[PDB]
Amino acid sequence: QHYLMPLRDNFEQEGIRNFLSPGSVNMAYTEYQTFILEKLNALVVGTDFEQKDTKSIVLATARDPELAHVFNHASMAHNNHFFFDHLSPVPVKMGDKLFYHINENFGSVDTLRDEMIGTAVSMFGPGFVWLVRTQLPGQPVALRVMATYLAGSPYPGAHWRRQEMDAQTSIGSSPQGLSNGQRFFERSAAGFKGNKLEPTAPGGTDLIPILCLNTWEYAWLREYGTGVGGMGGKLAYAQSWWNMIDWAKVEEEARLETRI
Amino acid sequence: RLAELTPRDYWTIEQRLSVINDTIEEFSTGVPYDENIEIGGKIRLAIDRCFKYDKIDEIIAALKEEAAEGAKGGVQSWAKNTLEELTQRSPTSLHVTLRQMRLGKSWGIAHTFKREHQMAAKFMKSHDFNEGVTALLIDKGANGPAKWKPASLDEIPPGANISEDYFRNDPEVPVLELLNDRSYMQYPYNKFGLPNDYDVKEAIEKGNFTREKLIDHFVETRRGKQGVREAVSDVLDRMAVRSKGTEHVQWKKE
Amino acid sequence: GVSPGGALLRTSRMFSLPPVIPPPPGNKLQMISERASATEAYPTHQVLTTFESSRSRGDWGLKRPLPLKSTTGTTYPMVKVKEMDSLEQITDFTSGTQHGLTLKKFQALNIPISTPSEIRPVQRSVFEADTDVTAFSPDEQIQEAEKRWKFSGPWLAGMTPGEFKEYLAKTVRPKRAEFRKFIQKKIAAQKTEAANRELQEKPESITDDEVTEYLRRLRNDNQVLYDLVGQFLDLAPLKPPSPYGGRGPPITHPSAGISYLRTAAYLNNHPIYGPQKSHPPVQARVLKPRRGNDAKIGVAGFVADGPLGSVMDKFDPSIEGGAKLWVNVDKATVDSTGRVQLTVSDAKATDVLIAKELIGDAREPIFGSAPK
Amino acid sequence: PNKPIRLPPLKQLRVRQANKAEENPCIAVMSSVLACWASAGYNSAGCATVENALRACMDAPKPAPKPNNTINYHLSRFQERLTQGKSK
Amino acid sequence: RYIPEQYLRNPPSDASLEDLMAAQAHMGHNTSLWNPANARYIYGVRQGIHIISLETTATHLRRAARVVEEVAYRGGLILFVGTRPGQRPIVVRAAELAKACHLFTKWRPGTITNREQLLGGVPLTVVDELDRPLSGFEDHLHDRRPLAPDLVVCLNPKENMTLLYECSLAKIPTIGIIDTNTNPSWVTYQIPANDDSLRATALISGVLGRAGERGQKRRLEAAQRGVVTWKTPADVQGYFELASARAADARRR
Amino acid sequence: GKGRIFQAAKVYQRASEAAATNIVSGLPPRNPPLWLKAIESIPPAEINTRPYPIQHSPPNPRARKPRNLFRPTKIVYPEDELRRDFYRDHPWELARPRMIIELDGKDARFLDWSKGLRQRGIPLSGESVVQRQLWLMENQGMTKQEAYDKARHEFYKLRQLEQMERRIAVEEARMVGGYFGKDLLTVGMELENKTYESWKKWATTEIARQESARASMYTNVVDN
RNA sequence: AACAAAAAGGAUUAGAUACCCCAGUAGUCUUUGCAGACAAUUAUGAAUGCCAUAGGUUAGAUUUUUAAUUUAGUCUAUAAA
Ligand SMILES: [K+]
Ligand SMILES: [K+]
Ligand SMILES: [K+]
Ligand SMILES: [Mg+2]
Ligand SMILES: [Mg+2]
Ligand SMILES: [Mg+2]
Ligand SMILES: [Mg+2]
Ligand SMILES: [Mg+2]
Ligand SMILES: [Mg+2]
């Protein structure tokens, strides 16, 4: 069965300094990751996914419509742990290599800050904001910001559930609305018939998530309160998060090829 | 299967016991997977601290320390239960019993049965035995509990010695004539069970094993005997500490 | 009391395999084919599955590993074992996809199983606490005996003249002495109801001759006696003097364990079109056209009667892959013979276009290029 | 009605002719020609068509034989498992 | 909790009742295809087959492991034999652990009773207590009778009785997996178990492979201390005698 | 007796006797085989002896001359009667694939049927209802029917949530830009199309045989 | 009526009593006696106690009558022998 694993630096015991109280991280990871794994176990208790890993269940249950409920619990457990696994007990100084690509791609580290934080609030819904690394066979490494919805995964092997654009406020009769609507059916029709829209490289090496931001309410509603009056809330939660990012590890997983 | 084992006349008793030991270990279906060592760890450590004296008064005094609140032993529930038992046992039997446990350690096996025959003779004449048996077995608990010669251990003053009377031979009782003249100070073949402190100690004082390597030394030496890993692990939890760090492990005594 | 080896085998997985249940009952006096046999109404053997790492090795938890040619390659690993070891020293097995995938295709319809109705359509679930009950008390009266679905006695109308004689000779004949006692217990209620109704202004319950006379009195009214005889032998109701006593009680649970939904009263919220009026349509295949003047359609692997309304009238060899028709499954029920019968109805026009739009088959998409 | 018996031990379980020894496809055409001569006569004109069909037989090539049937190989694998044994 | 490649990558030293039941070692043949002689190991009947008692399989397996360990401890030559299709990786792995020989193809009738014909040109070598090749036996290795195994572990006795009968004639002890239809008189040490499962055959074989490995370790450890657990075979023993005779002949001359 | 004389159980006795003395009388015996001392103290086990097998069911007491005394008996448990009842009321429960392949044989260590139908390591199946029923029917003293209804109703409410979650899980995924592949309803129909065509070709090619052989039945070859 | 030793005729054949053919009387059938010989065979007298399985089949019995269990027959193929 799938069991809960400890956190990075005993966050469950002490928690982050000025980002999450030990009681909040307890309700956010222990009392929730355990709840998700209990449901995940019941769904794979007697199937081939019984001994498979979370990410393996994600890629294997991405397109199958009869396993969408299994994808949620598997993808949620993977995304949730991916969030806490990149937090540092003490602020870290951004490396030189990473500090270069961020400025070359987004213009400035402060610009990337507002883009991710701005996307978290602009999304108005529980999800995850990713910092993806895209590198086509001919093009160089390029960093962008991808925002997934409730349990969507950023990996290319699970593009079937790359839930990054709501349909209730993005598909309409307006000029931009019709464009989104066309792309909607173009994906559903292409995916259904098996055709691929964007050619990808083998092994899903195109997109490599490096950083994540969990915007679900169970992670900040208790600590930063609702947010009425401009104090705390989902806004301050995203701001304080930006200070505890493990830029040392973020740069590592990025694997920015040295060319300077 | 034991009936099929046909030894050779020229095999020593050691070889014969080795053939039977290996035959009994084939029919083992494993020990319980959840049942843990009862007398082990905290309780086992408490027994070594409370039952190391030569006076039942001091033993009970030590138990009260364990049952007291805040005792670092952590066996409050156990110490309280043992106390409620000793109070019911015959106070004379406790003195006589605790006395033979300290003397029997230096007696021979043949000399032991002869002394006990004299001791048992004194109990037939005593009052506690006839009362305890008549009150518990013949009456089946009726007529209330037993009534020993002293109502409790507090009646026996410190200077009293109610044991020597039982360890003195009686000329009216002829010496016990045994069926043979064999004897020994320690069992010649009593190492077919699980490894105990004596075995683990010898292996440590002889070799220079480590924490995990030492456990495999017995799991291999006993050829996968069920319970060796749990037993050897427990012995080290009590009588072994990293005197040399993670490199090796030695005893806690010194 | 049992050795540790016998204790493990009991809770083992292979020991938990269910026994092979008898096949779905058919016409007893009708002829059949014994050499060849097609898919059955409902499954009789358990479908088995393995891990993908084990299937490549042929290990299915059975006595021996199965051949790879006939068990590898497909998507859904499913197998039915008839004998774990036959007289040929082989595991007589077959594919279990004919029923394993028929269950998944049916549950894809997202429809419950309702109680059979008579012809004001009122679809009532079969899992209701008042109807779905099998444990009854001896005090259980007759008015509440119609709600049950599992009876101990047989359905007299369904038995053959031979099975009925064997029943009368070996089941009801040796129960005369017991039935007389059953009357005495009623007399205890007959002499106390009139003897205890005025106290607020038990009887001896053991008689020999009074019973003989009470039964004679019932000869003028045969209905009150049948209700008393059926209640003793636990016979399923036959006529109204209600719970669909036409074809008899079901030989299985009214749902048959194929679906556990309790209602279809819900709306499908479309991403762009909001809630829908009816459930999405399902494409069906035409079998045995009218030109018997009745047509048969295959919906989700089950055979049902065509909608009450061409393609369903005359065969057309020109159509590729046969004739197909979009329909909507209105009601699903389980008859007394264990079959699953669907009341299919023709699907609307706009709905078939909405369904085809997602999968990318709609010619004129309702979105974007739909000015009117 | 009883079920098929279990064969006793045989020296070998096999079918004599594994492949169907089909008949020359034209021996049937000749019979038709010989049938007309009996009813319509020899030098008649009605049989002028069947004769052309008969002449068309031998001018066409003989179909090649089919590959051997492996039935006997599989019968020899399951003999002991399907019968009461194998005779020596 | 389970990986198909576990019985090969890391076989267990001892098999428990749960390991044997999970490996399907208790599933005998159809009740009709049974050798009534081996009704002593059958626990009951279920699913139309005979169930082999799990306690019986465990006891007999621990006994065979002792035999394999002692033969390897005394410097004996062992031979693991599994001929069924999917038994090659199992037998080769077991022989590797025990430093033994393997056989995964059809046994050639006469390789023991007629070893001069079948094993005439196969090369041998002479080694000491530390398995070090000894020099000076060139004349012996050329005029010598080929070797026969000191122990044979057969994973499917029912399919090769020619091998087991030659071991009976040559007075060679044998270990076999005796299924419900196999004759238990064909081997010296029986292991009642399902021989048709590659999961049960890998466990039994892996357990016997660990036994041989554990026996070879003790033999080579005693050698480092200068204690040889075996004596020179009679074949090589005679060579020493006539060898000194040739030296004794030249002693005078 | 076609069988051969197997003396595998007497290899040690035969080998030890041949090694006792030397064939060249007057000399000490050579060294014995290396395996002789290995199994010196491990004799074979008794074989071919027919014992009284374990009686899993009480033997017939009325029998005066019982046969098949040395025949193993059938293993039957109180759950066999219960499994047959459930799976006969829920035949389509057999269509749910179940993995009888064992992992480590330690499934029964985490099964406490006093809690409910959902246990550790095993899936929610008809077996859970039988084990839960048996527990109620033995501990809480319920009857076969009463314990059946209770464990049976708990089993339905769990199955309903499983089916309701598939539909809702797919419906919400599309509300946020989630698309899926083909479903069984579509895949199942395409396979029928490809198979229906094969039948059409066979029928079209098989009907030509009858109409041709039928018309040619008459000997109209005269062409009058 | 039919069949058919015998008797007789026609053929075949080196010859043909014969095998084949055209015909044909005892006899076969009925009732009453005589007769007592048979490959009257399972080339195996009758009977009793006992010894391991498997697959069919015949007449019942029991059962959760599906199919199992069992009593008495009969046959096939084997184990120990
Ligand atoms: K005639
Ligand atoms: K003549
Ligand atoms: K018979
Ligand atoms: Mg076998
Ligand atoms: Mg006559
Ligand atoms: Mg006479
Ligand atoms: Mg006769
Ligand atoms: Mg006679
Ligand atoms: Mg007859």
Name, in order, each residue with C-beta under 8 angstroms of E76's C-beta and a sequence gap of 6 or more.
E150, E151, F33, F34, F35, F38
Q: What's at B138, amino acid-wise?
A: I
Q: Six-digit token pair at E18? A: 């749960």
* Residues of E whose CB is below 8 A from B220: 214
- For residue D46, how far is its CA from the centre of ligand 2 (angstroms)? 56
Q: How many helices (H) and strands (E) in chain F?
A: 5, 0
Please name which of A75, A74, A71, A89 lies closest in space to residue A7, comparing C-alpha atoms.
A89
Strands E151-154 and E174-178 turn out to be parallel
Spatial contact of C249 and C336, defined as CB atoms under 8 Å apart = yes
Q: Which tokens hold the place of D58?
A: 């031998």
Among C272, C356, C361, the residue to mutate for chain A (most A Cβ within 10 A)? C272
For residue C129, CA distances in Å to B170, C132, C133, C311, F156 come to 85, 5, 7, 44, 12
Nucleotide nearest to C19 (CA to C1'): G66
State whether the Cα torsion E84-E85-E87-E88 is positive or negative.
positive
Residues of chain D positioned with their CB less than 8 A from the CB of C88: 78, 81-82
Contact across the interface for E186 and F8, Cβ inside 8 Å: yes
Chain F residues 66 to 95 with C-beta below 7 Å from nucleic strand G: 66-68, 70-71, 81, 84
List CB contacts (< 8 A) between B32 and chain C.
Answer: none
Backbone phi, psi, residue D73, to 5°: -65, -45
Q: Does strand G come within 7 Å of the CB of E47?
A: no
Q: Which nucleotides of G are covered by protein (CB under 7 A)?
A: 50, 52-58, 63-66, 69-71, 76-81
Name residues whose C-beta falls within 8 Å of residue E34's C-beta, 6 or more positions apart in sequence.
Answer: E28, E42, E50, E180, E181
Tokens, residue C295: 């047509």
Gap sites in chain C (C to N > 2.5 Å), preceding residue numbers: 119, 201, 241, 291, 309
Backbone angles phi, psi at E44, to 5 degrees: 180, -155
Q: CA of C25, closest CA in chain E: separation in Å? A: 24
The nucleotide closest to F3 (CA, C1' atoms): G79
- Per-residue H/E/C for A181-250: HHHHHHHHHHHHHCCCCCCCCCCCCCECCCEEEECCHHHHCCCCCCCHHHCCHHHHHHHHHHHCECHHHH
Reading the block at residue C282, the tokens are 């399902």
Contact of A251 with A98, CB cutoff 8 Å: yes
Position of tokens 């040796």? C174
Is the CB of residue B94 less than 8 Å from the CB of residue B153? Answer: yes
- CB contact, 8 Å: F166 with chain A? yes
D84 Cα to the center of ligand 9, angstroms? 22
- Are E184 and F47 within 8 A, CB to CB? yes
- Choose among E211, E204, E206, E159: nearest CA to E186: E159
Q: Which residue do the tokens 């540092």 mark?
A: A88
Q: Is E247 on the interface with C (CB under 8 A)?
A: no
Chain F interface mutation, best of B19, B24, B29, B35, highest count of F Cβ atoms under 10 Å: B19
- Phi and psi, residue A153, nearest 5°: -110, 145
Is chain B in touch with chain E: ≥3 Cβ pairs within 8 A?
yes
Q: How many angstroms separate the Cα of E158 from the Cα of each of E42, E58, E165, E197?
A: 18, 21, 12, 14
Q: Which residues contact E230 (CB under 8 A, 6 or more apart)?
A: E74, E75, E129, E219, F34
Q: How far apart are the first and last CA of chain A?
A: 47
Our measurement of CA B97 to C1' G38, in angstroms, reads 103
Rounded distance in angstroms from the CA atom of residue B140 to the C1' atom of nucleotide G48: 62
Q: How far is the CA of A246 from the C1' of G24 (A)?
A: 129
Q: Does F121 touch chain A (CB under 8 A)?
A: yes
Cβ <8 Å between C257 and F99: no
DSSP state of F179: -
Distances (CA, A) of E194 to A26, A192, D31: 51, 47, 65
CA C312 / C1′ G25 distance in Å: 84
How deeply is C231 buried, as exposed, middle or buried, from its count of CB atoms within 10 A (0-12, 13-18, 19+)?
Answer: middle
In the block, tokens 């034991």 appear at B2
State whether the beta carbon of D2 lies below 7 angstroms from any atom of strand G: yes
Give the three-state DSSP class for F5.
Answer: coil
Q: Which two tokens stand for residue B67?
A: 């049952």
b/e code F44-68 from CB counts within 10 Å (16+ = b): bbebeeeeebeebeeeeeeeeeeee
Q: Could you give phi then psi for residue C325, rounded to 5 degrees? A: -140, 135
Which string of b and e fits F123-152 if b means at least 16 CB within 10 Å? Answer: bbbbbbbbbbbbbbbeeeebeebbbbbbbb
Helix (H, G, I), strand (E, B) or coil at B140: coil
Contacts of B19 in chain F (CB under 8 A): 41
Give the whole-angstrom CA distance, residue F67 versus residue F70.
Answer: 9
DSSP bridge pairs for D86: D10
Distance in angstroms (rounded) separating the CA atoms of residues A156 and A152? 11
Question: Token pair 């004794």 is at which residue?
Answer: E248
* E157, E177 contact by CB (below 8 A): yes
- Tokens (6 digits) for C322: 């046969």
Q: CA F127: distance to chain centroid?
A: 14
On whether the CB atoms of residues F53 and E31 are closer than 8 A, the answer is no
φ, ψ at B73 (rounded to 5°): -65, -40
Long-range contacts of F52-58 (CB under 8 A, 24+ apart): F53/E39, F53/E42, F53/E44, F54/E43, F54/E44, F56/E44
How would you class C62 by CB atoms within 10 Å of its CB: exposed for 0-12, middle for 13-18, buried for 19 or more? buried
Say whether F51 and E17 touch across the interface (CB within 8 A).
no
Q: How far is the CA of F73 from the C1' of G68 (A)?
A: 13
CA C306/CA C287 separation, integer angstroms: 9
DSSP F115: T
E134 Cα–ligand 8 center, Å: 84
Residue B7, Cβ density class (10 Å: 0-12 exposed, 13-18 middle, ≥19 buried): middle
Q: How far apart are the C-alpha atoms of A18 and A242, rounded to whole Å?
A: 11
Which B residues, 110 through 139, put their C-beta within 8 Å of a C-beta on chain E?
none
F196 CB-to-strand G distance under 7 Å: no
How many Cβ pairs within 8 Å bridge chains B and F? 13
CB atoms within 10 A of CB E149: 25
What are the residues whose beta carbon lies below 5 Å from ligand 4 (ion)? E 179, 195-196
- Residues of chain C contacting E203 with CB distance shorter than 8 Å: none
Whether residues A181 and C368 touch (CB distance < 8 A) is answered with yes
CB of E224 lies under 7 Å from some atom of strand G? no
| Whole-angstrom distance, CA of residue E137 vs CA of residue B206 | 43
Check A190 against C360: CB less than 8 A apart.
yes
- Which residue in chain C has the smallest CA separation from D77? C88
Start-to-end CA span in chain D (Å): 33
Q: D69: Cβ under 7 Å from strand G?
A: no
Residue F64 CA to residue B182 CA, distance in Å, equals: 57
Strand G reaches within 7 A of the F50 CB: yes
CB E237 to CB F31 under 8 A? yes
Alpha-carbon distance B214 to C26, whole Å?
Answer: 71
Q: Which letter does DSSP use for residue E4 in this model?
A: T
Nearest Cβ partner of F99 from A46, A163, A184? A46
SS3 (DSSP) at E53: coil
State yes or no: chains D and C have 3 or more CB pairs below 8 A: yes
Distance of CA D79 to the CA centre of its chain: 26
Residue E107 per-residue DSSP state: P
Interface of C with D in 33-92 (CB under 8 A): 87-90
Question: Is strand G less than 7 A from the beta carbon of C22?
Answer: yes
The neighbours of chain E, by the rule of 3 or more Cβ pairs under 8 Å, are: B, C, F
Tell me, yes or no, whether chains C and A touch by having 3 or more C-beta pairs under 8 A.
Answer: yes
Experimental technique for the deposited model: cryo-EM
Q: C257 in helix, strand or coil? A: coil
Return the number of other C-beta atoms located less than 10 Å from residue A260's C-beta.
6
Helix or strand run (H / E) with residue C287: strand C282-287
Cβ pair C13:F83 closer than 8 A: no
Nucleotide nearest to E45 (CA to C1'): G68
Instruction: Give the end-to-end CA distance of chain F in Å, rounded to a whole number.
Output: 78
- Inter-chain contacts counted by CB atoms under 8 A, chains C and F: 180
* Residue A245, CA distances (Å) to A107, A239, A252, B167, E243 in order: 19, 11, 13, 79, 82
Contact A148, A132 (CB under 8 A): no
Q: For residue D47, which of D26, D25, D61, D31 has the smallest C-alpha distance?
A: D31
Please give the Cα distance from C19 to E244 (Å, whole number). 76
Q: Do chains D and A touch (3 or more CB pairs under 8 A)?
A: no
Distance CA F118, CA C92 (A): 33
Q: Which residues of F touch D47 (CB under 8 A)?
A: 221-223
Q: Collect all residues of chain B within an 8 Å Cβ-Cβ radius of residue E58.
A: 29
User: Tokens for E181?
Assistant: 């239809």
Rounded to whole angstroms, how far apart are CA atoms E70 and E88?
Answer: 25
**Contact yes or no for A181 and C52 at CB 8 A:** no
- Residues of chain F neighbouring A157 (CB-CB closer than 8 A): none
Residue whose entry in the numeric block shows the structure tokens 């409920």: A69
